Design a protein around this ligand. Structure first.
Ligand SMILES: *[C@@H]1O[C@H](CO)[C@@H](O)[C@H](O)[C@H]1NC(C)=O
Ligand SMILES: *[C@@H]1O[C@H](CO)[C@@H](O)[C@H](O)[C@H]1NC(C)=O
Ligand SMILES: *[C@@H]1O[C@H](CO)[C@@H](O)[C@H](O)[C@H]1NC(C)=O
Lengths: 97, 40, 97, 48, 49
């Protein structure tokens, strides 16, 4: 089995889901898989380029293997959840950042 | 005949798009400013 | 943010792979000069092979045979031959055969 | 300096540390848990 | 990749309001505003002190 970063050619008998844009989904394109907001994007992939990689060496865009539309992968949004409070020797109310 | 190869024979090293980066890689390239042979 | 659903897309190609043309061939060569077939651009149902009542060994490395049917490969080479059954010990990675 | 420290922290996610591949979702999708517990643990030990 | 950047507490505009106040203290009232109240003094005389 060769498992190279090159575009894949020998694929499992998988379902072929409909594409959804602008919502968070757990994608798998040609066996390359992750989670993100998928958006169609302006990025001028040359016709021989099959995906985009970032300054971080992360996968950043892909070309759907059933439609040559350039999907940007933006990670599903995240952050620290901080609690603002007076002392419990004043009130049990809180606000959340 | 031997002739200058300057700044030539670069190619996209893989099928990956990479906008706005100074990427770096080890691969088979024409050495810069070496000699290409010329024929007739 | 949590994902809504998974989206699976291998390419459009429904062409079945020739695993039943290799695993049934009349004359696997002497292990001296093995026959290799280069599988590409087809659907590989390896769960025809993993489920088989035939195979005495199904040892796998860097891939699990139960995960193998929901994956994709850049090519697959089916290197085929005959040996005395004891010699299976030398058909393994890193063994000093 | 603060940029060269953070770029080096980021680039080191792509390093293998003796694991089969630094894309942790590839290890998880390709290997069953008794073998993945050995491959993930090499990435954890490097990334930590 | 799990990296995040928190904002500073004082915005760069609020930092300019502190430097403005330190300028106005130093120009209108010499060293006095470091010791308590800004006692005004004319700037030609401040420079003589
Ligand atoms: C995908 O497969 C269908 C038949 O199942 C075919 O009609 C269609 O043209 C294919 N799409 C592409 C982009 O090749
Ligand atoms: C090319 O080869 C010659 C010898 O044939 C050598 O003297 C020269 O330095 C090389 N480079 C160029 C650009 O001529
Ligand atoms: C042998 O060929 C038959 C069809 O003739 C097929 O059903 C079977 O899967 C093949 N054997 C193996 C070991 O797959």
């Amino acid at each position: 089995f060769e498992l190279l970063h090159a575009p894949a050619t020998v694929c499992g008998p998988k379902k072929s889901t409909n594409l959804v844009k602008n919502k968070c989904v757990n994608f798998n394109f040609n066996g390359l898989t992750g989670t993100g907001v998928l958006t169609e994007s302006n990025k001028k992939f040359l016709p021989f380029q099959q995906f985009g990689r970032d300054i971080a060496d992360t996968t950043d865009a892909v070309r759907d293997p059933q439609t040559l539309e350039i999907l940007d992968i933006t990670p599903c949004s995240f952050g620290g959840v901080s609690v603002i409070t007076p002392g419990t020797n004043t009130s049990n109310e809180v606000a959340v950042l | 005949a031997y002739t200058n190869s300057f700044t030539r024979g670069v190619y996209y090293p893989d099928k990956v798009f990479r906008s706005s980066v100074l990427h770096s890689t080890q691969d088979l390239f024409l050495p810069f400013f070496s000699n290409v042979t010329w024929f007739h | 943010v949590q994902p809504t659903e998974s989206i699976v897309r291998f390419p459009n190609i429904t062409n079945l792979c020739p695993f039943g043309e290799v695993f049934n061939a009349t004359r696997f060569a002497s292990v001296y000069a093995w026959n290799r077939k280069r599988i590409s651009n087809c659907v590989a149902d390896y769960s025809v092979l993993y489920n088989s009542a035939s195979f005495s060994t199904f040892k796998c490395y860097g891939v699990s045979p139960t995960k193998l049917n929901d994956l994709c490969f850049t090519n697959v080479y089916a290197d085929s031959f005959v040996i005395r059954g004891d010699e299976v010990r030398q058909i393994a990675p890193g063994q000093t055969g | 300096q603060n940029a060269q420290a953070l770029n080096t922290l980021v680039k080191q996610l792509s390093s293998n540390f003796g694991a089969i591949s630094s894309v942790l979702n590839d290890i998880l999708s390709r290997l069953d848990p008794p073998e993945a517990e050995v491959q993930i643990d090499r990435l954890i030990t490097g990334r930590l | 990749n799990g990296l995040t950047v928190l904002p500073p507490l004082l915005t760069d505009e609020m930092i300019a309001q502190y430097t403005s106040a330190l300028l106005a203290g130093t120009i209108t009232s010499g060293w006095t505003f470091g010791a308590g109240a800004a006692l005004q003094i004319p700037f030609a005389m401040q420079m003589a002190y």
